């Protein structure tokens, strides 16, 4: 369920400020984006909201999107 797709960056390093605003919210529990993926497996408490991460990606300057796979 919880699968947040990479876009408008590349990768890696871009996956690695996704990854930190992930943690820096306090909703996170496991955050692990796949770079050669262009994906995101972030496990978040029943609290947050994954279109609120999206949104946060989004805000930053990035671009973010939802597919579980």
Do not use: R
Not at 11 to 36: I, M, R, T, W
């Amino acid at each position: 369920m919880t699968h947040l797709k990479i876009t408008g960056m590349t990768c890696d390093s871009c996956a690695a400020h996704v990854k930190e605003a992930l943690e820096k919210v306090p909703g996170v529990q496991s955050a692990l984006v796949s770079y050669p993926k262009g994906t995101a497996q972030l496990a978040i408490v029943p609290g947050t909201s994954p279109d609120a991460l999206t949104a946060a990606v989004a805000g930053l300057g990035y671009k973010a999107t939802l597919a579980d796979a």
